[PDB]
Write a protein that binds this ligand. Structure first.
Ligand SMILES: Nc1nc2c(ncn2[C@@H]2O[C@H](COP(=O)(O)OP(=O)(O)OP(=O)(O)O)[C@@H](O)[C@H]2O)c(=O)[nH]1
Ligand SMILES: Nc1nc2c(ncn2[C@@H]2O[C@H](COP(=O)(O)OP(=O)(O)O)[C@@H](O)[C@H]2O)c(=O)[nH]1
Ligand SMILES: [Mg+2]
Lengths: 247, 270
């Protein structure tokens, strides 16, 4: 029913486009400038049908992430939002006359962390932020704008990213395709065969979002939305929220 | 003749790949990319590689001055000091050498051009890009370059170029301007200067890989959906950037001497 997704990613890295593609609609997607004095968060809620299920979806985007010359403490407004939803849930549990069945859960159930496709490994900001978030939210690292990475570069880049996550002890969500998901988003259509498909048209070819040999979008949509939505909520409640509640 | 080209931009924008594509060189055989934890407080270092280039029939000493570490740290406050100090130091050495009695054997190490690589992943210039260019635009000939242009559709590419140009004007950034073509030059040279000027900022692709551009092995990048050709002007601006640099190397040197060096020299007086 209720599902809250946090998109952490640099300005223009494709957060709004990917969400529109994932749910096959047009959410609010006003671009940010690069001149925000610090990181802030934009939250929007939508009532969707995702198969048969009435879905109250909240999308929380970072704004201004990675844009300042001094990127110190960029994680703090993100953690503040995540902690505020933990605290709101806890205050609900501490009510005398309470109705947790009626309560609209606002806790982040999944964090899509958008990794810029440098082709090297992780930026210092990526490491610092994911380390600050990994005990607060289910981190799902993804390579954004993955059509940037050539066929002969993708596997090495994925492996370098995971090696950095492992060697630095970053805890990422384990789902109950080689990770991290390399995704492409697009609200534009291109005629492929006899059908109109979400795609990106270049002078040299067409990247098809739903072509699993082009990117991991289908696998992301499958794992995040079609399969493990309930598990992401439960891990949020029984692991991340419980850690906060313990203090 | 000697030419010194400085390269600045966020790590991972294909800068070393493009530089090696321009001259068919191998300037970074032992380069080590640091891990994320090492980049948290990484400092900018100057690295200079000098090679002999014999383009067409003219031989020239090319020095590429790279700035590894630029933009890596969490807090990029002093990411400009070392670069600015290096540029001013070359002005300082030249001034001492041309004022001395050994003027016959002066080695000109002044920086004649700076390729500033702009990320194609955002919407436009970032505060770091603006501050760095404003910090050096009175000292060096800035050539802004859109990196990894094969990440952009044509419409995205046109949109980003138009915005970068607007922001350069908004922030009063002085980039290098190509000389206007004289009237005595023939028509197909005047149109050449016009075509180069119209494509600024150049959006380029580089590659060290031979791919199959059906019929011939050429420089490019292979994707499951097609092949980007480095030297296809309908794919990216690599050839315009290369042609611009080779055609205007002498003018770049002369502006460095007549404008930036002279402004350093007069500003030098205490
Ligand atoms: N190469 C490539 N470009 C993409 C992809 N997805 C989106 N883009 C382009 O990048 C632009 C920026 O996308 P957005 O969705 O606005 O990025 P954002 O993260 O929401 O940016 P902000 O809201 O300003 O923080 C889009 O308008 C597309 O043109 C992708 O998968 N690959
Ligand atoms: N999409 C794309 N990738 C590139 C291009 N040039 C280089 N790369 C890749 O980008 C990654 C980093 O390139 P590199 O030259 O080391 O970047 P640098 O850190 O700025 O010197 C490597 O995987 C390259 O193969 C390009 O024009 N387009
Ligand atoms: Mg957006």
């Amino acid at each position: 029913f209720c599902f809250n997704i946090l998109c952490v990613g640099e300005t223009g890295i494709g957060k709004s486009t990917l969400m529109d593609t994932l749910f096959n609609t047009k959410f609010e997607s006003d671009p940010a400038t690069h001149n925000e004095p610090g990181v802030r968060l934009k939250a929007r809620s939508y009532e969707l049908q995702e198969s048969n299920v009435r879905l109250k979806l909240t999308i929380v985007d970072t704004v201004g992430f990675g844009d300042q010359i001094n990127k110190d403490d960029s994680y703090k407004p993100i953690v503040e939002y995540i902690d505020a939803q933990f605290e709101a849930y806890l205050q609900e549990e501490l009510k005398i006359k309470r109705s947790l069945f009626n309560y609209h859960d606002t806790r982040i159930h999944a964090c899509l962390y958008f990794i810029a496709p440098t082709g090297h490994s992780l930026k210092s900001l990526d490491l610092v932020t994911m380390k600050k978030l990994d005990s607060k939210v289910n981190i799902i690292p993804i390579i954004a704008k993955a059509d940037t990475i050539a066929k002969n570069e993708l596997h090495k880049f994925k492996s370098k990213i995971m090696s950095e996550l492992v060697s630095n002890g970053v805890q990422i969500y384990q789902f109950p395709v080689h990770l991290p998901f390399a995704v492409v988003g697009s609200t534009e259509e291109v005629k492929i065969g006899n059908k109109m498909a979400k795609a990106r048209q270049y002078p040299w070819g067409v990247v098809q979002v739903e072509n699993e040999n082009h990117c991991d979008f289908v696998k992301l949509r499958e794992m995040l939305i079609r399969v493990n939505m309930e598990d992401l909520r439960e891990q949020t409640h029984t692991r991340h929220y419980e850690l906060y509640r313990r203090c | 003749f000697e030419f010194t080209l400085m390269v600045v931009g966020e790590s991972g924008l294909g800068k070393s790949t493009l530089i090696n594509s321009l001259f068919l060189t191998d300037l970074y055989p032992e380069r080590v990319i640091p891990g994320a934890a090492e980049k948290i407080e990484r400092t900018v270092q100057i690295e200079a590689s000098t090679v002999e280039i014999e383009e067409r029939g003219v031989k020239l000493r090319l020095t590429v001055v790279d700035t590894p570490g630029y933009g890596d740290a969490i807090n990029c406050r002093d990411c400009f000091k070392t670069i600015i100090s290096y540029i001013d130091e070359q002005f300082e050495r030249y001034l001492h050498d041309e004022s001395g009695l050994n003027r016959r054997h002066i080695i000109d190490n002044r920086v004649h051009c700076c390729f500033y690589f702009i990320s194609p992943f955002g919407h436009g210039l970032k505060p770091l890009d603006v501050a760095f260019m404003k910090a050096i635009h009175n000292k060096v000939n800035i050539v802004p370059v859109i990196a990894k242009a094969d990440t952009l559709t044509l419409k995205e590419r046109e949109r980003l170029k138009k915005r970068i140009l607007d922001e350069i004007e908004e922030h009063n950034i002085k980039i290098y301007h190509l000389p206007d073509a004289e009237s005595d030059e023939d028509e197909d040279f005047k149109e050449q200067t016009r075509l180069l000027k119209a494509s600024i900022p150049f959006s380029v692709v580089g590659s060290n890989q031979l791919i199959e551009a059906k019929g011939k092995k050429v420089r490019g990048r292979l994707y499951p959906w097609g092949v980007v050709e480095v030297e296809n002007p309908e794919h990216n601006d690599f050839l315009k950037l290369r042609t611009m640099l080779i055609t205007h190397m002498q003018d770049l040197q002369e502006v460095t001497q007549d404008l930036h060096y002279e402004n350093f020299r007069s500003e030098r007086l205490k």
